């Protein structure tokens, strides 16, 4: 083996092979036992060698020491600074998900509110047209029959009804433009999450760099 | 000098929008003012604005709008009011005609304060009590009626099979079978007892008490018997009447004839709640008895006259709704006839929210799936990066169309460039009618949303996002001149026998034996059973997959191995799968605890799943169903299509068994707001509500109650925040005194246990607790006739704010441990208090009287001079309750309960136990509350920790009043309980591994993927031997306590 499962699966996360202990060892998810000691090419030379050659249905080894970007003391804070970036970035990441969540539920509340508006209007438009049948079926008289004891106060109903409708359509209008800025704000939060994601992934990866070199603060 | 004088300019205190989930009676406003202006629109065209009361009925506002229309024009053109009905737009945004005019204005959910008058359109007005169903479901029924998708229309119409069948079963032996539906007996799965229970009986006898009520009724009568634990209710009914009627004027012969007549006219009811002993079981098999045995209680039953019970049960009377080669298909082409590889055209994402600057490039990634993948992931080329991106490419997937297994799915996403995913979606490659999909499809995408760094996400839900305002992604599915279908069972069996016979005559040599005679090797024949017993997450090597796959025909003798076998099959081989299908056909049944694994997210195949359903159909008892109902409901999410075997199985048991039904209803309803499952679950709820009979009206009270409590607590958490508790409490009582509250919160069944009735509110004892989420502590009169023998006052907690459903699971796991332990000899008394999520971060939590946190204990005993708390205060407090022969048992309980909880909290890895996490009852039982993050989510920042660390405090109580308490024999016997308990759970490890896996379907951030469950493997140590695990447990227990845990065992 030449020294010079749960965590092997977790470190294989986000990689589009490596050797592990238990057969006695395991090449890794697609698991390959090393039982297949007691063979040609003392363990390590079989790994360099490589996959269709025996299995019908079958380049990137992972053991970088990560000095790529010498103290022990000073590298200990290079976690404490990167992890505070990571955690302050993480804090900001999941801060916006609350906003992403709250806004999206707020958004869908608005269109379902607008559907109630639209529908409410259709009852009020239908109501002004209800009287013009039943009012001008009895506008038959017009001027006589004790002057205008009927037809003056009928016009007041019609006046409020129409000015009421006026206010409803204004209220909806107001909500619809409320929704627009909200739609744009929603999109804008998602936008900055996507730029944060790979910064947050690289920061979490580079936090793993200064961890695995070393092998209180946090 | 503190901060090197460095100013923070960015900082500012005013609203820092920086708290350091969240409508009511009208739109935008929670509580409508007590008098309100309500526009009333008529057939006249006159909009007469009434000022009515918030809490006034429609009867009232009608019979006042009748009178005040006599003051407005066009009066004789208004008909008699008795020929009219109200209607308005609600907040859900529909025209809700208002039939039950006893309803109050505040309960209508009106959006805008107005009414319209109309006549009863649809004169079958009793039919338009779909309203009931809509209220119960939490969306309108007519919203389903206008759904295009035929699958939905087909689900609604075809699922009535089960409803009608199930209603027939209820009225088979009526009214008995109706009472079995309504009041199913509440009994354990084993009829025999564990030995520690038996030994509280002097050679198997319980002292019971039967109660009777003869006129004037005013009086009741003990009849204390002493009968066998295993005798049935029929017998106990007899001996109870023997005693009643025994006399100096009855002979022995004349007694027995009186007994026989009276016997078959009564049944047994538990006193103080609506439980009932309705069939032949041993008395001790019923849970109430077995509770009474253990708790040290004398069962109080009651002779209920069958007349007066069959008097209470109403006719269910289900009725069907308005929804009531030889075809144009011509089975046009079988899938296996087609000659090309799969290819799928991806073209144009309408929009994506990305920065032009920060992100370099983007592309649509794809792959075909079956849970885990049957070919290389096919990325599409980069185009028009971060700015109106469209493609027009076909990706060519290396799998020949005939190989595609029945449950194959396209899984796609859209990624960045240094890679991260932007949006995602999946599609069933076959539609619900076995048809291989063709034409163009519009796949609206989901967000990732959180966590999930993986690019593709196939464990997520299939189908498009029903939010239109998302990344859409148009795509064309290849068309093979004619409509394609998956082959019939005839076709597949034929091909099986072919490749089976084609095996038989193959050569001497074949890459040795790479994937494959009847020469039954004896070292190998033991290797199968060794693999058979491994845990579901013990990742298998492809050497073992071939090994297994080769002896597939042998594996049928070890039926338990099937989950391992099925994962070993190649699903991109039409050949291998066809043979597997035929094994699964004949395969003999397995234990329900294993069959459940075959309904998790790794086994999508309909045949596999149908098997699993048949295991459960034969083997799973109604008891064990209602234990595991949560998982089975969450596993519907992973089903491909709406209509399926598992939904039919659950809908039937829900309509068989009103105890199941109740939780089956709530468990759907609680996840209803979650739009991903919303449609599947609603249609199911619609089918249940349509078929369950009068219970629908009981549920509607429960729902109507919950809404009031949701609405009340919202007002407390916004607005009436930043007000003294004294102010909040003046508001709380004022509001519960209101008449709509009194209506809604008084006559109903506790959702935590529908057995327990809730009668009148004792406002006296109702209060807003100290927690910041403003939970309400509620308290109702038990309106039972024998309330005295159980509890004069039922009280439970309603908490709007926390997501209960984590607690809900850990308590479920705790209960399942307690039961494993109990029936395996070990008495470790846990207290899994009742908890129920009933909506998005809203629920109910059972109170446990005479219990207090260690913090409260320490404040009573805490000496007036505020220097330091003594650790003995707990031990002294416990003595002050428990004095005499009592005392020793009170320790036994503590020690037993502490141990049980020590093991479970370690294993589950629940949140750190401190003093306000742990509670102690007066009788000396210990139990944990508020568990928090369960599989150790708290490691995601920077192990294998012991969350229940035994302070000095507990150790004293464990060892009686002691100096050097870790050396006592009291502490040894405690240590042995932990060692026996830890092993016991480990020996049943499979169940817990599966139980957690099945719960990946829910949105809980502590169960995102199988690697989150992995913790539980470590902590039970299954990759090691049981003697190593023990020593691992001892090690880890030694680590936390600083010494104590160095021991050895005699028995292996
Ligand atoms: N005790 C008991 C438990 C479950 C049962 N299922 C059936 C049915 F016949 F399948 F309905 N009968 C049962 C009796």
Give one DSSP letter per residue of A92-132, joined into a string.
HHHHHHHHHHHHHHHHHHHHHHHHHHHHHHHHHHHHHHHHH
C-alpha distance from A2 to closest chain B C-alpha (Å): 23
Q: Which atom of ligand 1 is nearest to the CA of B279?
A: 1
Contacts of B1029 (CB under 8 A, 6+ apart): B982, B983, B986, B1020, B1021, B1022
For residue B165, which phi and psi values (nearest 5 degrees)?
-50, -50
Q: In this complex, how many residue pairs, one in chain A and one in chain B, have their CB atoms less than 8 Å apart?
A: 146
* C-alpha to C-alpha distance for B47 and B740, rounded to whole angstroms: 27
Among B621, B624, B627, residue to substitute to test ligand 1 (most atoms within 8 Å of Cβ): B621
* DSSP designation for B370: B
Q: Which two tokens stand for residue B891?
A: 């320790």
DSSP E strand stretches across B296-386: 300-305, 333-334, 341-349, 362-369, 378-379
Contact B844, B813 (CB under 8 A): no
Contacts of A173 (CB under 8 A, 6+ apart): none
Report the DSSP beta bridge partners of residue B835.
B845
Domains identified in chain A, total number: 2
CA B92 to chain centre: 26
Among B173, B622, B626, B657, residue to substitute to test ligand 1 (most atoms within 8 Å of Cβ): B622
Contacts of B447 (CB under 8 A, 6+ apart): A100, A190, B423, B470
Q: Do B45 and A56 touch (CB under 8 A)?
A: no
**Strand B333-334, strand B484-485: pairing:** parallel
Say whether the peptide bond before residue B137 is cis (omega within 30 degrees of 0). Answer: no
Q: Do B354 and A191 touch (CB under 8 A)?
A: yes
Q: Do B47 and A127 touch (CB under 8 A)?
A: yes
Q: Which two tokens stand for residue B900?
A: 């049980």
Set of chain B residues whose Cβ sits within 8 Å of the Cβ of A211: none
User: How do the residues of chain A divide into helix, strand and coil, expressed in percent and rounded to 5?
Assistant: 60, 5, 35
Q: Do B41 and A127 touch (CB under 8 A)?
A: yes
For residue B101, which phi and psi values (nearest 5 degrees)?
-80, 5
Dihedral-angle region of residue B825 (phi above 0 means left; psi in -120 to 50 means alpha; beta otherwise): left
**Strand B95-98, strand B85-89: pairing:** antiparallel
**B 906-965 → A contacts, CB under 8 A:** 941-942
Question: Residue B251 CB: number of other CB atoms within 10 A?
Answer: 9
Q: Do B447 and A190 touch (CB under 8 A)?
A: yes
Same domain for A88 and A141?
yes
* C-alpha to C-alpha distance for B678 and B562, rounded to whole angstroms: 33
Same domain for A101 and A158?
yes
Contact B336, A170 (CB under 8 A): no
Among B186, B178, B185, which Cα is nearest to B311's?
A: B178
* C-alpha to C-alpha distance for B800 and B717, rounded to whole angstroms: 9
Name the residue among B27, B93, B469 with its Cβ closest to that of A119: B93
The experimental technique used to determine this model is: X-ray
* C-alpha to C-alpha distance for B648 and B642, rounded to whole angstroms: 10
Upper half-sphere CA count for residue B934 (Cβ side, 13 Å):
29
- Residue B154, CA distances (Å) to B430, B643, B724 in order: 17, 8, 56
Decide: B177 in ligand 1 pocket, CB within 6 A. no
Report the DSSP beta bridge partners of residue B341.
B400
Q: Do A160 and B353 touch (CB under 8 A)?
A: no
* DSSP designation for B446: B
Same domain for A14 and A96?
no
Among B901, B902, B876, which Cα is nearest to B890's?
A: B876
Report the topology of domain B333-485.
Answer: Immunoglobulin-like (2.60.40)
Chosen for mutation from A95, A127, A132, A208 (greatest number of chain B CBs closer than 10 Å) is: A127
Contacts of B4 (CB under 8 A, 6+ apart): none
3-state class (DSSP) for residue B845: strand
* C-alpha to C-alpha distance for B1027 and B979, rounded to whole angstroms: 11
Same domain for A184 and A214?
yes
Q: Which residue has the tokens 């707001």?
A: B673
Chosen for mutation from A155, A198, A207, A208 (greatest number of chain B CBs closer than 10 Å) is: A198
Decide: B622 in ligand 1 pocket, CB within 6 A. yes
* C-alpha to C-alpha distance for B575 and B507, rounded to whole angstroms: 19
Q: Which residue has the tokens 């056909």?
A: B585
Q: Which two tokens stand for residue B363?
A: 């592309």
- Residue B344, CA distances (Å) to A31, B59, B465, B479, B600 in order: 30, 62, 20, 10, 28
Same domain for A103 and A196?
yes
Q: Which residue has the tokens 């009106």?
A: B110
Among B919, B914, B926, B857, which Cα is nearest to B890's?
A: B926
Upper half-sphere CA count for residue B895 (Cβ side, 13 Å):
22
* C-alpha to C-alpha distance for B344 and B982, rounded to whole angstroms: 52
Report the DSSP beta bridge partners of residue B39.
B49, B114
Contacts of B847 (CB under 8 A, 6+ apart): B777, B795, B796, B797
Among B139, B27, B131, which Cα is nearest to B85's?
A: B131
Among B379, B370, B433, B380, which Cα is nearest to B404's?
A: B370
- Residue B930, CA distances (Å) to A129, B669, B803, B845, B911 in order: 60, 23, 11, 11, 9
Element (H, E) at B150: helix B150-158
* C-alpha to C-alpha distance for B1035 and B1028, rounded to whole angstroms: 10
Name the residue among B43, B114, B419 with its Cβ closest to that of A130: B43
Q: Which two tokens stand for residue B509?
A: 């040599």
**B 663-702 → A contacts, CB under 8 A:** none
Give one DSSP letter per residue of B872-887, joined into a string.
HHHHHHHHHHS-THHH
Contacts of B340 (CB under 8 A, 6+ apart): B400, B401, B478, B480
Structural domain that includes position A197? 70-218
Among B825, B808, B809, which Cα is nearest to B983's?
A: B825
Chosen for mutation from B43, B73, B142, B909 (greatest number of chain A CBs closer than 10 Å) is: B73
Set of chain B residues whose Cβ sits within 8 Å of the Cβ of A201: 420, 453
* C-alpha to C-alpha distance for B756 and B791, rounded to whole angstroms: 10
Q: Do B45 and A195 touch (CB under 8 A)?
A: no
First to last CA, chain B: 66
Q: Which two tokens stand for residue B938?
A: 């708290």
Among B240, B224, B377, which Cα is nearest to B304's?
A: B240
**B 1018-1037 → A contacts, CB under 8 A:** 1018, 1023
Question: Residue B88 CB: number of other CB atoms within 10 A?
Answer: 25
Give one DSSP letter per residue of B255-294, joined into a string.
HHHHHHHHHTTEEEEETTSS-EE-SS--GGGBHHHHHHHH
Contact B458, B409 (CB under 8 A): yes
Same domain for A8 and A92?
no
Q: Which two tokens stand for residue A49?
A: 């060698």
* C-alpha to C-alpha distance for B227 and A93, rounded to whole angstroms: 66
- Residue B34, CA distances (Å) to B101, B289, B432, B715, B930 in order: 19, 50, 53, 16, 39
For the range A204-207, what are the long-range contacts, defined as Cβ-Cβ under 8 Å and sequence gap of 24 or more? A204/A86, A206/A69, A206/A82, A207/A79, A207/A82, A207/A83, A207/A86
**Strand A25-27, strand A32-33: pairing:** antiparallel
CATH number at residue A114: 1.10.287.1490
Same domain for A1 and A60?
yes
CATH number belonging to domain B489-699: 1.25.40.70
3-state class (DSSP) for residue B379: strand
Report the DSSP beta bridge partners of residue B119.
none
Contact B38, B113 (CB under 8 A): yes
**Alpha helices, H only, B745-871:** 805-823, 854-861
Same domain for A148 and A121?
yes
Same domain for A65 and A99?
no
Decide: B621 in ligand 1 pocket, CB within 6 A. yes
Report the DSSP beta bridge partners of residue B207.
B226
CA of B546: which chain A residue's CA is closest? A55
Q: Is B511 on the interface with A (CB under 8 A)?
A: yes
Element (H, E) at B968: none
* C-alpha to C-alpha distance for A34 and B237, rounded to whole angstroms: 69
Secondary structure of B28-48 in HEC code, one letter for each residue: CECCCCCEEEEEEECCCCCEE
- Residue B79, CA distances (Å) to B204, B273, B521, B954 in order: 75, 50, 92, 78
* C-alpha to C-alpha distance for B653 and B632, rounded to whole angstroms: 12
Burial code (b: 16+ CB inside 10 Å, e: under 16) for B314-343 equals eebebeeeeeeeeeeeeebeebbebeeebe
Contact B948, B1040 (CB under 8 A): no
Contact B265, B318 (CB under 8 A): no
CA of B774 to the centre of ligand 1 (A): 44
* DSSP designation for B770: S
Contact B691, B665 (CB under 8 A): no
CA angle B1015–B1021–B1023, rounded 5-degree value: 105
Burial code (b: 16+ CB inside 10 Å, e: under 16) for B105-141 equals bbbbbbbbbbbbbeeeeeeeeeebebbbbbbbbbbbb
Q: Which residue has the tokens 């449609």?
A: B679
Same domain for A78 and A167?
yes
Same domain for A135 and A104?
yes
Set of chain B residues whose Cβ sits within 8 Å of the Cβ of A218: 941-942
* C-alpha to C-alpha distance for B39 and B60, rounded to whole angstroms: 15
3-state class (DSSP) for residue A192: helix
* C-alpha to C-alpha distance for A178 and A182, rounded to whole angstroms: 6
Q: Which atom of ligand 1 is nearest to the CA of B169?
A: 11
Same domain for A55 and A75?
no
- Residue B386, CA distances (Å) to B281, B393, B698, B703 in order: 69, 18, 54, 47
Give one DSSP letter per residue of A119-176, joined into a string.
HHHHHHHHHHHHHHHHTTTSTTSTT-SSTTTTHHHHHHHHHHHHHHHHHHHHHHHHHH
Q: Which two tokens stand for residue B617?
A: 């159909």
Contact B83, B117 (CB under 8 A): no
* C-alpha to C-alpha distance for B952 and B971, rounded to whole angstroms: 12
Q: Do A127 and B416 touch (CB under 8 A)?
A: no
Q: Is B95 on the interface with A (CB under 8 A)?
A: yes
Contacts of A136 (CB under 8 A, 6+ apart): none
* The total number of residues written for chain B in this structure: 1052
Decide: B173 in ligand 1 pocket, CB within 6 A. no
**CA dihedral sign, ordered B593, B594, B600, B606:** negative
Contact A216, A133 (CB under 8 A): no
Name the domain boundary from A13, A47, A69. A69
Set of chain B residues whose Cβ sits within 8 Å of the Cβ of A195: 354-355, 358-359
Contact B175, B702 (CB under 8 A): no
Q: Is B115 on the interface with A (CB under 8 A)?
A: no
Q: Which two tokens stand for residue B1036?
A: 């880890």
Name the domain boundary from A30, A51, A69. A69
* C-alpha to C-alpha distance for B398 and B394, rounded to whole angstroms: 13
For the range B888-893, what are the long-range contacts, defined as Cβ-Cβ under 8 Å and sequence gap of 24 or more? B889/B924, B890/B923, B890/B924, B891/B924, B891/B957, B891/B958, B891/B960, B891/B970, B893/B829, B893/B923, B893/B924, B893/B925
Question: Residue B348 CB: number of other CB atoms within 10 A?
Answer: 16
Set of chain B residues whose Cβ sits within 8 Å of the Cβ of A107: 469
3-state class (DSSP) for residue B729: helix
Residue B867's Cβ-count burial label (10 Å; 0-12, 13-18, 19+) is exposed
Chosen for mutation from A109, A152, A197, A206 (greatest number of chain B CBs closer than 10 Å) is: A197
Dihedral-angle region of residue B540 (phi above 0 means left; psi in -120 to 50 means alpha; beta otherwise): beta
* C-alpha to C-alpha distance for B571 and B406, rounded to whole angstroms: 9
Q: Which residue has the tokens 């499962």?
A: A5
Name the residue among B27, B514, B1014 with its Cβ closest to that of A56: B514
**If you count DSSP H runs as helices and E runs as strands, how many of each does chain A have, helices first?**
5, 3
* C-alpha to C-alpha distance for B315 and B305, rounded to whole angstroms: 19
Contact B208, B292 (CB under 8 A): no
* C-alpha to C-alpha distance for B188 and B621, rounded to whole angstroms: 10
C-alpha distance from B45 to closest chain A C-alpha (Å): 4
* DSSP designation for B788: G
Set of chain A residues whose Cβ sits within 8 Å of the Cβ of B469: 107, 183
CA of B176 to the centre of ligand 1 (A): 14
Contact B896, B828 (CB under 8 A): yes
Contact B371, B604 (CB under 8 A): yes
């Amino acid at each position: 083996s030449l020294q010079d499962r749960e965590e092997v699966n977790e470190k294989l996360r986000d990689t589009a092979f490596l050797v592990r202990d238990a057969g006695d060892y395991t090449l890794t998810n697609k698991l390959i036992k090393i039982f297949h000691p007691l063979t040609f090419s003392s363990v390590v030379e079989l790994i360099n060698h490589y996959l269709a050659q025996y299995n019908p249905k079958l380049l990137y080894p992972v053991s970088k020491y990560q000095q790529d970007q010498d103290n022990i003391e000073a590298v200990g804070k290079k976690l404490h600074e990167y992890n505070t970036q990571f955690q302050e970035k993480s804090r900001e990441y999941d801060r916006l998900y609350e906003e992403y969540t709250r806004t999206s539920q707020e958004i869908q509340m608005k269109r379902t509110a607008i559907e109630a508006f639209n529908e409410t209007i259709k009852i009020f438009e239908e109501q002004c047209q209800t009287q013009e049948r039943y009012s001008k079926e009895y506008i038959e008289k017009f001027k006589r029959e004790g002057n205008e004891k009927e037809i003056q106060r009928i016009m007041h109903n019609y006046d409020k009804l129409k000015s009421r409708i006026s206010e409803i359509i204004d209220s909806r209008r107001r909500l619809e433009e409320d929704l627009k800025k909200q739609a744009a704000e929603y999109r804008e939060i998602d936008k900055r999450m996507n730029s944060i994601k790979p910064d947050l992934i690289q920061l979490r990866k580079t936090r793993d760099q200064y961890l695995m070199w070393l092998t209180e603060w946090l | 000098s503190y901060y090197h004088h460095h100013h923070h300019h960015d900082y500012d205190i005013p609203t820092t929008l920086y708290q350091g989930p969240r409508s009511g009676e009208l739109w935008g406003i929670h509580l409508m003012p007590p008098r309100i202006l309500v526009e009333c629109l008529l057939p006249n065209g006159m909009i007469v604005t009434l000022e009515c009361l918030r809490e006034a009925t429609l009867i009232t506002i009608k019979h006042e709008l009748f009178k005040e229309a006599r003051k407005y024009p066009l009066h004789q053109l208004l008909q008699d009011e008795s020929s009219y009905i109200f209607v308005s737009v609600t907040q859900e945004a529909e025209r809700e005609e208002f039939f039950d005019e006893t309803r109050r204005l505040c309960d209508l959910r009106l959006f805008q304060p107005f009414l319209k008058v109309i006549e009863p359109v649809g004169n079958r007005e009793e039919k338009i009590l779909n309203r009931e169903i809509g209220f119960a479901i939490g969306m309108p029924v007519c919203e389903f009626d206008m759904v295009k998708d035929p699958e939905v229309q087909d689900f609604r119409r075809n699922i009535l099979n089960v409803c009608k069948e199930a209603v027939d079963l209820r009225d088979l032996n009526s009214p008995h079978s109706r009472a079995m539906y309504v009041y199913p007996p509440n009994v354990e799965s084993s009829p025999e007892l564990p030995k520690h229970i038996y030994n509280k009986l002097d050679k198997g006898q319980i002292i019971v008490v039967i109660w009777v009520i003869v006129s004037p009724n005013n009086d009741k009568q003990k009849y204390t018997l002493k009968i066998n634990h295993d005798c049935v209710p029929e017998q106990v009914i007899a001996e109870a009447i023997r005693k009643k009627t025994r006399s100096m004027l009855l002979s022995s012969e004349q007694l027995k004839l009186c007994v026989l007549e009276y016997q078959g006219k009564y049944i047994l009811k538990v006193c103080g709640c609506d439980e009932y002993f309705l069939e032949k079981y041993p008395l001790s098999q019923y849970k109430y008895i077995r509770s009474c045995i253990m708790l040290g209680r004398m069962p109080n039953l009651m002779l209920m006259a069958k007349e007066s019970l069959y008097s209470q049960l109403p006719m269910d009377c289900f009725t069907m709704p308005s929804y009531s080669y030889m075809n144009g298909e011509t089975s046009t082409k079988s899938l296996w006839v087609i000659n090309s590889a799969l290819r799928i055209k991806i073209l144009c994402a309408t929009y994506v929210n990305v920065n032009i600057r920060d992100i370099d490039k983007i592309y649509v990634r794809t792959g075909i799936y079956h849970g885990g993948e049957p070919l290389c992931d096919n990325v599409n080329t980069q185009r028009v990066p971060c700015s109106n991106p469209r493609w027009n490419e076909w990706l060519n997937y290396d799998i020949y169309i005939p190989d595609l297994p029945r449950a194959a799915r396209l899984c796609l996403s859209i990624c960045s460039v240094e890679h991260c995913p932007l949006a995602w979606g999946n599609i069933n490659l076959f539609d619900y009618t076995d048809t291989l999909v063709s034409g163009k499809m519009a796949l609206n995408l989901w967000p990732v949303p959180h966590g999930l760094e993986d690019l593709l996400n196939p464990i997520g839900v299939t189908g498009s996002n029903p939010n239109k305002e998302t990344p859409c992604l148009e795509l064309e599915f290849d068309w093979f001149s004619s409509v394609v279908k998956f082959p019939d069972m005839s076709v597949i069996e034929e091909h099986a026998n072919w490749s089976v016979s084609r095996e038989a005559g193959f050569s001497y040599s074949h890459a040795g034996l790479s994937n494959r005679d009847n020469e039954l090797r004896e070292n190998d024949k033991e290797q199968l059973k060794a693999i058979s017993t491994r845990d579901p997450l013990s990742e298998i090597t492809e050497q073992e997959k071939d090994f297994l796959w080769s002896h597939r025909h042998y594996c049928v003798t070890i039926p338990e191995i099937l989950p391992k076998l099925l994962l070993s099959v190649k699903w991109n081989s039409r050949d291998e799968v066809a043979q597997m299908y035929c094994l699964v056909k004949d395969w003999p049944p397995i234990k329900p605890e294993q069959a459940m694994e075959l309904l998790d997210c790794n086994y999508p195949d309909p045949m596999v799943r149908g098997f699993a359903v048949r295991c459960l159909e034969k083997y799973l008892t109604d008891d064990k169903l209602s234990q595991y109902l949560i998982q089975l409901v969450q596993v519907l999410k992973y089903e491909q299509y709406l209509d399926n075997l598992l939904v039919r199985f659950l809908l039937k048991k829900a309509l068989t068994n009103q105890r199941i039904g109740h939780f089956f209803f709530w468990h759907l309803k609680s996840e209803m707001h979650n739009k991903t499952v919303s449609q599947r679950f609603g249609l199911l709820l619609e089918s249940y509500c349509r078929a369950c009979g009068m219970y629908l009206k009981h549920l509607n009270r429960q729902v109507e109650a919950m809404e009031k409590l949701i609405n009340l607590t919202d007002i407390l958490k916004q607005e009436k925040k930043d007000e003294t508790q004294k102010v909040q409490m003046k508001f709380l009582v004022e509001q519960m005194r209101r008449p709509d509250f009194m209506d809604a919160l008084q006559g109903f069944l506790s959702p935590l246990n529908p057995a327990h009735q809730l009668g009148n509110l004792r406002l006296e004892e109702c209060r807003i607790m100290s927690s910041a989420k403003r939970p309400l502590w509620l308290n109702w009169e038990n309106p039972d006739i024998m309330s005295e023998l159980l509890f004069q006052n039922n009280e439970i907690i309603f908490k709007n704010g926390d997501d209960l459903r984590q607690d809900m699971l850990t308590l479920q796991i705790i209960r399942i441990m307690e039961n494993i332990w109990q029936n395996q000899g070990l008495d470790l008394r846990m207290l899994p208090y009742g908890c129920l999520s009933i909506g998005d971060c809203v629920g109910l939590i059972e109170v446990v009287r005479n219990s207090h946190t260690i913090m409260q204990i320490q404040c009573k005993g805490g000496l007036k001079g505020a220097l330091q708390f003594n650790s003995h205060t707990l031990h002294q407090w416990l003595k002050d309750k428990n004095k005499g022969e009592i005392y020793d048992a009170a320790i036994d309980l503590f020690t037993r309960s502490c141990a049980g909880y020590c093991v479970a909290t370690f294993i589950l890895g629940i949140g750190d136990r401190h003093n306000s996490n742990i509670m102690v009852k007066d009788d000396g039982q210990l139990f944990h509350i508020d568990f928090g993050h369960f599989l150790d989510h708290k490691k995601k920042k920077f192990r294998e920790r012991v969350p229940f660390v035994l302070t000095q405090d507990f150790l004293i109580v464990i060892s009686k009043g002691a100096q050097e308490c870790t050396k006592t024999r009291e502490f040894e016997r405690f240590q042995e309980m932990c060692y026996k308990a830890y092993l016991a759970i480990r020996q049943h490890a499979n169940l817990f591994i599966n139980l957690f896996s099945m719960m990946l379907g829910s949105g809980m951030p502590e169960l995102q993927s199988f690697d989150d469950i992995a913790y539980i493997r470590k902590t039970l140590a299954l990759d090691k031997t049981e003697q190593e695990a023990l020593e691992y447990f001892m090690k880890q227990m030694n680590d936390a306590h600083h010494g104590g845990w160095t021991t050895k065992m005699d028995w292996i």
